[PDB]
Design an enzyme around this catalytic site. Structure first.
Site: not given
Ligand SMILES: O=c1ccn([C@@H]2O[C@H](COP(=O)(O)OP(=O)(O)O)[C@@H](O)[C@H]2O)c(=O)[nH]1
Ligand SMILES: [Mn+2]
Length: 338
Positions: A8, A67, A126, A178
């Site tokens: 995604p 979105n 991280r 998830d």
């Molecule tokens: O509106 C959104 C925002 C996030 N993403 C995707 O969902 C995943 C969430 O990951 P993110 O890295 O932003 O979260 P984090 O690293 O903070 O856990 C990523 O692959 C983003 O590209 C998405 O599909 N739609």
């Molecule tokens: Mn991420």
């Protein structure tokens, strides 16, 4: 095709080539995997970067009309398109080891896993759970391993496991979605395996939705095709982790007072789906919290958290290292609390 890698994306233009390069670099035949990108209506040049790789990879590229605000609907759209025998979710800002698909394929052909955890490594500060990746294991359960402590979807799932059991990400619940997805996979999997030979995966609002997901997880555990005592134990382990590490921990000390009734009501509906017999199975310190959550009593719940945090109790004694605590006047005594 062995694998569908599901990605995604959303305004991922500055970092998506790292993931895309790591997939192009897989020491694995291109004919045997596809990359399924579903873009969450990005406003940058994510799609155009993705297109640069359509010759190096078997690439399916989609984009939602608007979105969705999270990875749930993108991943679901990709999962419906996947034709791999197995799927692997990788987020747009992460990347994987060049030998990931090769190693996973060999492990699967040796062990026929339905869910395969693959060891993670945190970069740029991280983390990254670790307690379940100390060893490679062909078969683990929810009760003899630590897999319940990692519920992100950055794992390998047998595509037919998901689809035959209708296991999808909740789209209308934007928080912790998830956790339900991976819990459902765990509970339906005939075999869960852990591959820890190397670092494979490199990782970079109101609570109504959050606690609805938790309540669905409780219902899912209690309804699984498992022995009754085992369901109760699994639910107890999920509660141990949830109260120790989720946003629930210490919420009555952090959330604005005006908003805590809304928290206790949503938390209470979650805990009310947990039969009270399970409280005996949970870490003793959490028992007063389960009690006052079920009763949706924020004042006593907050006193318990404040008492723990400052060491002051309304009435207590100590029996062989454990405390019997009455947290307020007229309230029940809670016994044997470590
Ligand atoms: O509106 C959104 C925002 C996030 N993403 C995707 O969902 C995943 C969430 O990951 P993110 O890295 O932003 O979260 P984090 O690293 O903070 O856990 C990523 O692959 C983003 O590209 C998405 O599909 N739609
Ligand atoms: Mn991420």
């Amino acid at each position: 095709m062995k694998f569908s890698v599901i990605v995604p994306t959303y305004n991922s233009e500055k970092y998506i080539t790292e993931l895309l390069n790591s997939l192009a670099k897989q020491d694995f035949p291109k004919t045997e995997f596809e990359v399924v990108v579903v873009d969450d209506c990005s406003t940058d040049q994510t799609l155009q970067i993705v297109e640069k790789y359509r010759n190096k990879l078997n690439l399916k590229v989609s984009q939602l009309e608007t979105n969705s605000g999270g990875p749930g609907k993108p991943r679901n759209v990709a999962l419906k398109q996947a034709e791999g025998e197995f799927v692997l979710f990788v987020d747009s800002d992460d990347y994987i080891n060049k030998e990931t698909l090769k190693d996973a394929a060999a492990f699967i052909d040796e062990h026929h896993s339905d869910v395969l955890l693959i060891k993670m490594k945190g970069v740029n500060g991280r983390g990254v759970p670790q307690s379940m990746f100390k060893e490679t294991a062909p078969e683990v359960t929810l009760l003899n391993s630590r897999i319940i402590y990692t519920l992100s979807p950055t794992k390998i799932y047998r595509t037919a496991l998901l689809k035959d059991n209708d296991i999808y990400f909740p789209e209308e619940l934007k928080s912790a979605e998830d956790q339900l997805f991976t819990m459902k996979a765990y509970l339906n999997a005939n075999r869960i395996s852990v591959l820890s030979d190397k670092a494979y995966y490199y990782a970079t609002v109101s609570p109504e939705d959050f606690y609805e997901v938790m309540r669905l997880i409780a219902v899912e555990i209690l309804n699984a095709d498992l022995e009754e005592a085992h369901k109760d134990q699994i639910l107890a382990e999920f509660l141990n982790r949830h109260f120790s590490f989720s946003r629930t921990n210490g919420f009555s000390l952090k959330v604005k007072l005006e908003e805590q009734p809304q928290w206790i009501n949503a938390l209470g509906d979650f805990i009310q789906a947990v039969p009270e017999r399970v409280d005996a199975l949970v870490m003793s310190k959490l028992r007063p919290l389960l009690h006052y959550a079920r009763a949706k009593d924020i004042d006593n719940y907050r006193t318990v958290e404040e008492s723990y945090r400052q060491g002051q109790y309304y009435r207590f004694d100590i029996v062989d290292g454990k405390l019997n605590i009455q947290f307020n006047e007229g309230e029940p005594y809670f016994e044997g609390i470590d």
